[PDB]
């Protein structure tokens, strides 16, 4: 998986975007690079064994609406190492790194039906006391929950569904 080779470039970009106060621009630039890297013809150019210099020109020319510091170099250095398929992973790495520095958590909540917006605001302020970050809830309407809610906060989760309790009781028996 490309996550490991993404990490040096994603850290170099994230460490660099804060030296130049343009994290927000870099993020959409990488989301651009991740969308073009999915194209079926571009992936054939990537698999086509050009030499890195001429392949680099054949990629930099096609993605010209990028700064000199940003586009023309990150895309070239990853192209010499052949890492450009890592770009969808470089994106998520970059986002996570940001959410880390900005003390944010992209908390997810899951429920059988919509919450009352008092329930949901209570959930926000309580997760912000459980954690030490500004949370950003997003809900999901999953009918298997039946009742209650799931709160997922990255690698950590908090099951309040009735289905989980039902199947827990089925094993306490």
């Amino acid at each position: 998986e490309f996550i490991t080779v993404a990490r040096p470039y994603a850290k170099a970009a994230f460490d660099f975007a804060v030296e130049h106060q343009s994290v927000e621009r870099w993020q959409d630039m990488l989301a651009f690079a991740a969308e073009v890297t999915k194209n079926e013809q571009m992936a054939e150019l990537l698999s086509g064994a050009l030499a890195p210099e001429t392949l680099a020109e054949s990629f930099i020319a096609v993605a010209g609406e990028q700064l000199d510091e940003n586009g023309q170099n990150l895309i070239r250095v990853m192209a010499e190492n052949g890492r450009l398929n890592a770009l969808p992973d470089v994106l998520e790495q970059f986002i996570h790194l940001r959410a880390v520095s900005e003390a944010t958590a992209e908390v997810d909540v899951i429920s059988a039906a919509a919450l009352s917006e008092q329930q949901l605001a209570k959930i926000s302020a309580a997760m912000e006391k459980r954690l030490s970050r500004k949370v950003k809830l997003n809900a999901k309407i999953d009918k298997s929950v039946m009742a209650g809610v799931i709160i997922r906060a990255g690698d950590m989760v908090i099951d309040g569904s009735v289905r989980g309790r039902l199947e827990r009781l089925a094993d306490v028996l």
């Binding site: 969308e35 073009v36 194209n39 571009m42 698999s47 054949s58």
Partner: protein, 83 residues
């Protein structure tokens, strides 16, 4: 801008006139010690005979992703890249 940006890319790619290989064709990308590596050649079956320049043939023994390994049946010092 996903649909617009991916159209922008499709047009710039076509306008640069980079283009796919045909199926059943490929190019030699490495020649070494009587073993060649071919890029492309998507419709190649394992054990198939692939015609080289000349009347020479190679047997496709290894079907990796993004590469083919073929073995040359005869003298191989005449081959190169781009064939």
């Amino acid at each position: 801008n996903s649909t617009e940006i991916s159209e922008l890319i499709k047009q710039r790619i076509a306008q640069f006139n980079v283009v796919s290989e045909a199926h059943n064709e490929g190019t030699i990308v490495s020649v070494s010690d009587g073993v060649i590596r071919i890029h492309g050649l998507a419709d190649a079956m394992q054990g198939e005979m692939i015609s080289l320049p000349g009347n020479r043939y190679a047997i496709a023994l290894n079907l990796e992703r993004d590469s083919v390994g073929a073995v040359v049946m005869g003298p191989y010092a005449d081959l190169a890249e781009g064939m």
